Every structure is written in C-alpha cells, then in structure tokens.
DNA sequence: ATCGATGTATATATCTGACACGTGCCTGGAGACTAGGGAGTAATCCCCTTGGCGGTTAAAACGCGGGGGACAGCGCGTACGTGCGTTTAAGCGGTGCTAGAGCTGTCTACGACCAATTGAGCGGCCTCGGCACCGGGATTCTGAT
DNA sequence: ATCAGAATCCCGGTGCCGAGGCCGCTCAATTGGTCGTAGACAGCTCTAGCACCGCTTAAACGCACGTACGCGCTGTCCCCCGCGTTTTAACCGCCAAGGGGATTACTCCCTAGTCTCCAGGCACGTGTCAGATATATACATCGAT
C-alpha cells in the first residue's frame, strides 16, 4: 500500500521532551528511524534466541530484559532495565 | 559496455579520503592499492545487492537492497531505510 | 615567492575534510564504476539514485576507516608516509585479507 | 473511549506497534503482554540518549536542527553508544576531528 | 530413568563419511564438531531465508529463498555447487512423489 | 495404505528432509515453509558435510590415520580457501593451528 | 587475587609459540594477562547472563557457546 | 663446554612443536581458578560444568593465539622480531577492540 | 620578535526549499469475550559438581652468561608535497520518454492441521581394533671447528 | 666440509577404551484428506531512471623544484634466550556428599483469535524561517628573516 510505517512522530515527541527547541533534519530523521529499527531487530532477535535456548515459546519482559543486558553496554543496560521494569510496573498498576 | 572506470576514482579523491582518515603523507602506489581494495569491496557489496535484487525478481537495484547487502557483511548503514 | 612548509597544507586538508561532510569521490565516475562492476553479475541493470548514494557512502566510510588503520600502522612502523604494505597489514589484521 | 497502551505505560513509543512487529516479525509463536512495553521503553531511552547528545552537539555547532553530523558526533563521542554502534555507518556523518600526535608539527 | 532423546546429525554425517571415505572413521569430538557445523550452517541459511522472506513481504520459505540464502552466505564455487546439488535434489524429488 | 517412503530417499539424500522440515517449522523462521525448502536445505547441508569430510579424510590419510579427529577437520578447513572463508570467525576446539612460520624468522647463512 | 598470575609466563610463551612468535618482550606477559582478563570478563559476563535467564545456578557449556556466538566467535564441538 | 643452541633455534623448535600439536597450553587448574574468580564478580556461589570451563579455555587459547599471530605480523611490519605490548595494542586497535 | 601573506572564521544580508503544522481519512490499534495450552510450581531422583588426600613428576621459578636484536644516530637521494598553468569532465538545469516498480483483482495450487501408523532414530550394552604409550634405533639438524 | 651431540622421527610391541555395531522401544515422520489463504499471474498506472544538450567552472592533470623522509649502515648495550638447578603445584586417581538440573504431573492464567469500533497516524498540502550562499572583513597562524 501507499502508506509506509515509520517512527517519525514518536522520535519527534521524544526530541520535544528532551530539547524543546531543536528540530531534526529529514536525513537525521531517516537515520534515527533506521537506528530504532536496527536496535529493535537486535533486541528482538536476541530475545527470540533466548526463548529458543530455554525451550520457551513466548517472548516476555524477562527475555527482553536479558537481551537488553546482553547487547546494551552496562550503563545503558542498567538504566534501560530499571526504567523498563518501571514502565511494566506502571502498566500493570494501571492495568 | 562501460570500461576502464576504476581510474575514475582519481588520485585527488584517494588523497581526500586519506586526509579524512588523518593520513598526512601518502606514497605513490597507495592509489593503485586503494583502487584495488575499493574494487574488491564494491564487488562484494554489489554481488550481494544484485543477489537480493534477483530474489525479488526486479531489474532495478533498490537502495534497500544495498542496505541489506551491507547489513549482511556487518557494515550496517543508517540513512536509507531500516 | 611564499611557499608553505611540506606538511602543513596536508594538515590543513586533514582538518578541513575531518570537519566536513561532503562526499570526496566524484559522483559520476563512482556511479560509472558501480555500473561497470554490476554488469558482470547481471546485464541491463538499473540503479536507484539512492542506491548509488548508499554504495558511495559505504565505500567512502570503508576507505576512510581503512586509511585510519593504515595511518595507525604506518606510525607504528615509525613512519608518516603510508605504504601499500601498511594497507595490506591493516586488511590482514582486520580479517579481510 | 479507548486509552492507548503507551499512555498506560507512560511512554511515547507505540506499545501497539511494537507488539504487532514482535508478533509478525517471527520471533516466537507467542508474545507476552509486558514485552512490547519493555521494548518500547528501551527503544525510547536509546532514542532519548542519542537525541540528547545530538542536541548538545547541535548547540556546540550553534545549530537548532539535528543533522547527521550531530548524530555522528553524539555517537562517536560517547563511549557506550560507540560500542553499541561500532559496526554501524552513519550517512553524511563524517568522522571525529582526530589528528595523530606524531603528525603534528615539531 | 531413561534419558530423553537428544537429536543429532551424527548418523547422517557418518553415512556421508562412509560414502566419501568408505574406510575412514571419526572420533566423538570430531562428530560433535560436525554436528555443530551442520547446526550452525543450518541456522545461518535459515535465518538468511527468513530475512529474505521478510524483506519481500512474503510468508513462505521456499527453494527460491534457500537458494538465494546459499548464494549469499556460501562462497562462489561452494555456492555454485551447493545450488547445483540442491536444485538437482528438488527436481528429482518433485519428479517422484 | 502405501508403504512408507522417507522424504530423504525420495530426494536421494542422506540428511533428514523431515527433521529439517520440522526444524524450519519450529525454528520461527516464517509462518509457512515450502515443500522443496527442506529438500534444498538438506541437499546443501549434505554437500557441505561431504566437502569437509572428504578433505578431512584426505588429511587423516596424510597423517596415516583412519579416524578423523578435530585436528584433521581444522587442517581440512584452514587448508581450503573457500571453507576457511565460510568458517573464518569459527574456532574449532582441539583443532590446533596451521603450521606457518614467517620467512623473516627463519635462520640465515 | 593471585589467580591471574596463574596464567604463567611459560604458558604465555607457549601460546605465542603456537602463534608463531620467535622473540617475546618481558612486558608481553602482563599485557597478555590484561587482554585475557578482559576477553574472559566479556565472555563470562554474557554466559552468566544466559545462566541467570535460565534461572540456573550452574554455568553450562551451552551458555558459554551462546555467549561466544553473541561475541561473533563460534566454537565447534562443545554442543550447539 | 656444554652445548648451547644459538638464541632463536629452540624458539623455532618450540614454534614447530606447538604449531604441530593441539593440546591446551594453559594449565587447567589455574585457568579454572581464574574463571571462577572472574565469575565471582557477576554472581556469587556460581558453579561450572567441566565442559563449560573447557569451552572457555579453548576459546581463550584460540583468541590469544590469533592475537599473537596478528601481533607477530605487525611486529614484523615494524622491521622487528620481538613482539612488544605496542604490537598487541596495534593489533587490538585495528581489530576494533579498543 | 615580526610583519606579510594567507587561508579561514565571523558577522551580516538575501533567499529558498524543507521542515513543522493542519486536515481528512482509513486502517490499525483498543475494549471485550472466548478457549486452550504453555508456563508456573511442587516433588523426586540421580548425576555431576565440589571438596579433600596423597604422591609424583613435570613444569614453573630463578640465576646467569652472552649474543643478537632493539634502538639511536647519521648520511643520502629520491619520491612526494606544493604551486601554477592548462584542460577536462563533473555538475546543474531542462526536457523526454519509456521501462519497470508498485498496486489491485482473481483464483488455484499449496501448505497448515489432524488423526492413525510405523519404522527410523536414539539410548544402552558389548566388543575389538585404532591409537596411544613405551622404548629403542635411525635420521635430521644444528653449531663449533 | 666435518663431526658430535641433542632432538625428533620411525618402527615395533602391548594395552585399553572408545568407536562401531546390534537390539529394544517410542515418538516423530509419513500418508491421506480437508480447507483457508497466499502468491502467481494479468493488467493498469505513473514514477523515476536513463538519455541527451549546453554551459560553467572547479577539479584534475602535467610538470618543475626543493626538501623531508624512508632507508641503509654502524655502533652500543641491554635484555631476552637458553640451560642448569631447585621448588611447587598440576594432575591423576580415588572417595564422599549434596545440591541442583532435569523430569513429570497438576493447575490456572495469559495470550491468540475474532469482533466491533474509533481515533491515531500517515499522504497531501502549505507557509515561513533556519540555514545556505555571497560578500566583506578580521584574525590568527605560518614562514622567512
């Protein structure tokens, strides 16, 4: 179909949250979108391998957490893991 | 049939590529060596991209084909699609 | 007349091209080279402009990183000039040669 | 009235799209409920880190618009993201302004 | 109890060995290496065919995808002969039931 | 009911077409798997096994042995260029290395 | 502890001999111990990650093979 | 005078001997103690399968041998024979490990 | 030092196209309900990891002499950097057209699924031959003469 | 060239233990049938890739010249090799224990699947402002004296 799927709007929302005066070029937009896609593919492939190694048939928060601890460097992994459990906690509390 | 287009990667182009790499002084055979290295790299990436193209039954090498070719060798490239 | 000491125009070029972002290979000869290489794998091919641009970006990035490693291993030999043996050593250590 | 899952999790990234991409991307036959939430939070963090350092880089070059050069400076200047994107090429990103000490004039 | 089944390519590697070298044996560690090699190349080719099917918005892995994944991963003489063997096997198998 | 015939026998292969098919279906590679895909994959795996095993048997003969040990697989792989390319990032346990001394280190007269 | 010194100087010399090295500087031994400590730390950290995910208390060979596979160096003959 | 080989002959003989063989060149109990010491930092009260330590040792020795090959190559590149730590650092920097 | 050449940064003014916002729509995501099966948990068993003792022997540690290799200094000559005039083609802008990417519709072949069958493949047991360990003579190779 | 000595290679004998083969079993592949759906093919649109012409101008190119750097040679000294002696702890074997890894059984809750709806996100459109370009200029840095 004519539509294409991208993370433009979400990246912009994060950018406005961080630096609420700065724009982003279209080339830099394409780079950020491909970066999000590449990191998603890495984490998802590692979680798939993780679920396959332990004879599991489901990707859960535990497999995503372990895949983050595997690929992300330690400071990035630590802060992303703590926030991710905070986000999962917020989602379960609100249901 | 295009021929002798490897010399189109001129000597000043190789010197600019070296300057961006931090190279201060260049020998005289570095140009031929770099043309050979670039030819090998381009052959590998273009072979992988033309394979990706032929699989999709297309005749036009898409930029996403080149991105997948680069990803296959581990030389991931951002800015032409994910 | 006035002439610069051999090596400072080179350092000026290093600073210029490390501050800059343009493509350092002319686009039309590189595109012709891409066409010539691709005619062997399949005849009567076509290339998107963005495909040739991505190929050129990858080629220039690869050559610049190779020249960084070449420079490092030429300094390692207590030289400043880079020789073809420096490129051969860098590629052999990287695992491509 | 339907409340979106991103707002429930408190994220900007789409939990629904991440769940759909996990389900269609052939990673497992099932996908837990907390997995897209966790993945969206991690992706949002990496986006926020890259964009924060790129905005700092854009301020350093006195610009108000992130271009690929600022993303390259943000990536290659930080160590953790340089480890993360060590095999990654950024188009129109250039290189770090680094000159070897031996080549500097005497 | 009775140990649960652990499947391996040991007997198939041994059959191929008795075909190419009718009198040569193989140790257990070399058999484990061959099993790891078959599993590794299998997961490489299958992941590449999976990515190929995902890139073209398709949902079936066919002989086309496996052939293209062999052309991608395997080196050219090896790819050419593996493609010849796989094509020969698919034709002879389709000719029969 | 017709007598059972293995898919590998139909394809003329030693490697298991049915097991490769089950692994492709359970491996989470696609929602569907073609009929000739495990046949093609089993043929490719059998060919690569035949290549390494032939070269390893040659190496085992050269060391006057009749069993293939990890050393013979390592010699077979690293002595062939194309397989060394295919297994470049691969380390073979108990395989050793190729006998190779740089000519500068050799003595002189 | 003293365990990194357990990778003795003759063992490093033997590893260099297998690598084809004819002459070894005296500081290669400490440099090699540092290199080995970092490679081991990366592989073992990833293996213990794979172990903790499996809710195990022992580090299996398979986990080491997986950690190596993630590093991009693939080990044959230990399973997989 | 007792016979002494010229400096570098026994080194070449060792090169040929250890390139001909396949045993592990690091003693197994020191390497095992080192592995457990390193793993003590990531999780306390860990246990190891024997084959896990064996796989770690095979990988470590293969990594170190390939590193010493690259180190020797870049030492010969500098018109030298002795390998220095700067040779190791060059090999690791070109290999993208620094 | 110093002043002159000289390239490069900096400050300001015009423009311009690309980015930031609005709109309409439509299709993908959310609420709700269902089944079913995968995962959580609890008990069991056994194997395989950890810990200890002893000897014994090969390997590691240490000392020492010396030689050869790292390294610093020096000379030279040549190859490369710099500059300048010429020429060459890359680039840009407009215009053409047609091949082929991309989308839609239809339908049929093909693969998921499911039940019954059974034979291939795996675990276990046993044995014999390939290989390994030992020892001793032969050959090679190295270094001093 | 020679020769002695040290190390390795080879040849034969003995043993041993792991690879090869056989057998029971069990569960995973095969066969036969059904059904939904996906992808193969036809056909239509319309985008963009290729081809071309012309002008401009900045980059490439050829050459002259000087000089800095690569490279070869020489001397020195230091520090690594190689070998003899002492020490130590790795390894092998043997035994004991226990803890945790793998297995099975039961349950329940968590996720796929379907439906219904609706709002968010994504082509299209637009306008306006940040940055590109141009120009003058200031300024710091390089160089010869």
From TrEMBL, chain F:
Residue ranges, compositional bias (Basic residues): 1-8
Protein's job: Core component of nucleosome. Nucleosomes wrap and compact DNA into chromatin, limiting DNA accessibility to the cellular machineries which require DNA as a template. Histones thereby play a central role in transcription regulation, DNA repair, DNA replication and chromosomal stability. DNA accessibility is regulated via a complex set of post-translational modifications of histones, also called histone code, and nucleosome remodeling.
Gene Ontology CC annotations of this record: nucleosome; nucleus
Transmembrane segments: none
Residues of the full protein shown: 12 to 120 of 130
Similarity-based family: Belongs to the histone H2A family.
Domain Core Histone H2A/H2B/H3 stretches: 1-78
GO molecular function, one term: DNA binding
Name of the molecule in the record: Histone H2A
Limits of the Histone H2A C-terminal domain: 81-109
Subcellular location: Chromosome; Nucleus
Origin species: Xenopus laevis (African clawed frog)
Record's subunit section: The nucleosome is a histone octamer containing two molecules each of H2A, H2B, H3 and H4 assembled in one H3-H4 heterotetramer and two H2A-H2B heterodimers. The octamer wraps approximately 147 bp of DNA.
UniProt keywords, alphabetically: Acetylation, Chromosome, DNA-binding, Isopeptide bond, Nucleosome core, Nucleus, Phosphoprotein, Ubl conjugation
Biological process terms in GO annotation: heterochromatin formation
Phylogenetic classification of the source organism: Eukaryota, Metazoa, Chordata, Craniata, Vertebrata
